[PDB]
Design a protein around this ligand. Structure first.
Ligand SMILES: Nc1nc2c(ncn2[C@@H]2O[C@H](COP(=O)(O)OP(=O)(O)O)[C@@H](O)[C@H]2O)c(=O)[nH]1
Ligand SMILES: [Mg+2]
Length: 202
């Protein structure tokens, strides 16, 4: 018996929280592989479903997105992807179309998730109404906080359901995660859940 394994590319501007987000899955960080000529660290994030074990091999940069773009070797062969931005920084959000363009050019029709990070910070700039454009382009969206573990499993459970072709797939136990470094206020989570429903119903 082989192993069900998927290449996932994690892309987005420098300073958005990619490396902090991938590092929450503790065993993936313990067993990572550094490849210097690609400019990447590959993290084996294993998840446990109702039909069995799955592995997402997550590609995280070495910081080369701050002074340029990524080569075609980073993207080639991906089976899925996560594009991240920071919700307190608008310039990170306005560069999302160009990240989506590179994934489309090299990979064509793969399932892609858009993540808005740092939702624990009180003064938020980019809200739920500005995400509607990307939903009409066929991206899936989640509000994320890497430091408190808020919605960590969401992007991985949607991508597993798409790849396997099963809308009733579930995770039967959670992976060991790095203890929260900040508290996600419960009044801010209740308000942001309401903003998203308003925007995508009405
Ligand atoms: N409060 C808070 N700070 C965050 C969060 N995610 C990232 N940061 C901060 O963002 C900065 C950049 O983080 P890093 O993981 O290196 O991001 P990257 O360059 O995109 O890989 C650091 O100072 C982090 O501590 C988040 O969930 N909450
Ligand atoms: Mg990084």
């Amino acid at each position: 018996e082989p192993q069900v394994q998927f290449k996932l590319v994690l892309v987005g501007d420098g300073g958005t929280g990619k490396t902090t987000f991938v590092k929450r899955h503790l065993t993936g960080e313990f067993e990572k592989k550094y490849v210097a000529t690609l400019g990447v660290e590959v993290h084996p994030l294993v998840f446990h479903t109702n039909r069995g074990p799955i592995k997402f091999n997550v590609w995280d940069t070495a910081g080369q997105e701050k002074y340029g773009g990524l080569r075609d070797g980073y993207y080639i062969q991906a089976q899925c992807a996560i594009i991240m931005f920071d919700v307190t920084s608008r310039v990170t959000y306005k560069n999302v179309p160009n990240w989506h363009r590179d994934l489309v050019r090299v990979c064509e029709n793969i399932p892609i998730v858009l993540c808005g990070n740092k939702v624990d910070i009180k003064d938020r700039k980019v809200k739920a109404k500005s995400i509607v454009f990307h939903r009409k382009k066929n991206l899936q969206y989640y509000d994320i906080s890497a430091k408190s573990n808020y919605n960590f499993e969401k992007p991985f459970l949607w991508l597993a359901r798409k790849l396997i072709g099963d809308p009733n797939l579930e995770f039967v136990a959670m992976p060991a995660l790095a203890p929260p470094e900040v508290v996600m206020d419960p009044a801010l989570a209740a308000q942001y859940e309401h903003d998203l429903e308003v925007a995508q119903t009405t």
